């Protein structure tokens, strides 16, 4: 039926450099296309209409080209704020629909995690639960390891952990794993520690606390 | 300023109903057809239905005829989503939105959460994480709040009633493996100036009506009753 093809789904490109994202229709559309920008969370943005034309309030940086089968949105010069999912919309036929998104990664220079380590709440301990939660603040890439040691035996199937998307100002990313015991199993070690890998450190990060 | 303001957002049982609402303000409202758009499962941005600029006419996505009505009250600039018969496919984000009808949609609300569902909605614990020597470094100390257990998503967390935004990062939650959701809310403040600032973490639930204020603050670590084990 009328469907796109968005490509590529998935780009990581510098700031300052130009960028184009492609969408294929089956059928042809004459022009009759839209460009949007979604953030995690957040609410899309118009872009682009009549496949050419600047949304108000939009930077100049944007624009769309192209006709028949073959559209195009093309960024200038990357900007930080311009990461996120772009989604073309065709209003051809009933329903409008929507592409399956192209999602746009800044890369930037490598940034390694400063690491933090939050032992249980009081109040957390006298309901009968110990949360001990392990912070990497923004880094870049994404990639970081979290190893949980207790009284240094490494530690498995008490952990969960996850990333933010990417911010809009340094291009970062930060994680945060928590890891969870019964109180009684709390009571029973003395060294919680939070062991990080990041291609920014070079010797891992070791945050810990003896309970007391 | 354009502005979209939807309500509703909760656990619905399988088969159940719900009116979702809208509050517009800063254009004419009765110029303009008015829309939802649904985030479905995958991801995907699904139009479900609009209402013409009078609330004449109205119009709907195979998936929801006979099933989902919209209507809009042009003497208070809102816009309502009626759904009977919900399913479990209709989960989903849920945006009002202003049609430039048969075209695109140009102003978007935040959306609003459906969860259809056969389990309980749970209010959260909510439980300090406390600046200390563990969280600090460069002058620069991290504290957050830990929101544990509970169903649906989503919860929305503010620093100060709205005053503190810079450095907050408020992750994605993890689901435990009781069915009940967790997060973690962080921000880095000077340290200088832990004894003179006082920092609020503001939760809402508001699939179970709950809202949770808490008091981050240092916590002194000695006590005259203390052992070492």
């Known amino acids: 039926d009328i469907q796109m093809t968005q490509s590529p789904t998935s780009l990581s490109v510098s700031v300052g450099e130009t960028v184009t994202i492609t969408c294929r229709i089956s059928e042809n559309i004459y022009s009759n296309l839209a460009w949007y920008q979604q953030k995690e969370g957040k609410s899309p943005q118009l872009l682009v209409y009549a496949a050419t034309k600047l949304a108000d309030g939009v930077p100049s940086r944007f624009s769309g080209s192209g006709s028949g089968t073959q559209y195009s949105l093309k960024i200038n010069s990357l900007q930080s704020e311009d990461f996120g999912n772009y989604y073309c919309?065709?209003?051809?036929?009933?329903?409008?629909?929507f592409g399956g998104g192209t999602k746009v990664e800044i890369k930037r220079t490598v940034a390694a995690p400063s690491v933090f380590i939050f032992p249980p709440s009081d109040e957390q301990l006298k309901s009968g639960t110990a949360s001990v939660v392990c912070l990497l603040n923004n880094f870049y890439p994404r990639e970081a390891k979290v190893q949980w040691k207790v009284d240094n035996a490494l530690q498995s199937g008490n952990s969960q952990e996850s990333v933010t998307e990417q911010d809009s100002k340094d291009s970062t990313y930060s994680l945060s794993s928590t890891l969870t015991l019964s109180k009684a199993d709390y009571e029973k070690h003395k060294v919680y520690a939070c062991e990080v890998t990041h291609q920014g450190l070079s010797s891992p990060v070791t945050k810990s606390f003896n309970r007391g | 300023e354009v502005q979209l303001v939807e309500s509703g957002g909760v656990l619905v049982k399988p088969g159940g109903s719900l009116k979702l609402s809208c509050a517009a303000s800063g254009f004419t409202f009765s110029d303009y057809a008015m829309s939802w758009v649904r985030q479905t499962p995958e991801k995907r941005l699904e139009w479900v239905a609009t209402i013409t600029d009078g609330g004449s006419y109205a119009y709907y996505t195979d998936d929801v005829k006979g099933r989902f009505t919209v209507s809009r009250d042009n003497a208070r600039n809102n816009l309502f989503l009626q759904m009977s018969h919900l399913r479990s496919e209709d989960t989903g984000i849920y945006y009002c939105?202003?049609?430039?009808?048969?075209?695109?949609?140009?102003?978007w609300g935040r959306g609003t959460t459906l969860t259809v569902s056969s389990a309980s909605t749970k209010g959260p614990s909510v439980f300090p994480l406390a600046p200390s020597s563990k969280s600090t470094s460069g002058g620069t100390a991290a504290l957050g709040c830990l929101v544990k257990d509970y169903f649906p998503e989503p919860v929305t967390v503010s620093w100060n009633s709205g005053a503190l935004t810079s450095g907050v990062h408020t992750f994605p939650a993890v689901l435990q493996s009781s069915g009940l959701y967790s997060l973690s809310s962080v921000v880095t403040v000077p340290s200088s100036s832990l004894g003179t600032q006082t920092y609020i973490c503001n939760v809402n639930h508001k699939p179970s009506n709950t809202k949770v204020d808490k008091k981050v603050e240092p916590k002194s670590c000695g006590s005259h009753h203390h052992h070492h084990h």
């Open positions: 919309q065709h209003f051809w036929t009933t329903p409008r629909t």
């Open positions: 939105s202003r049609d430039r009808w048969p075209y695109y949609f140009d102003f």
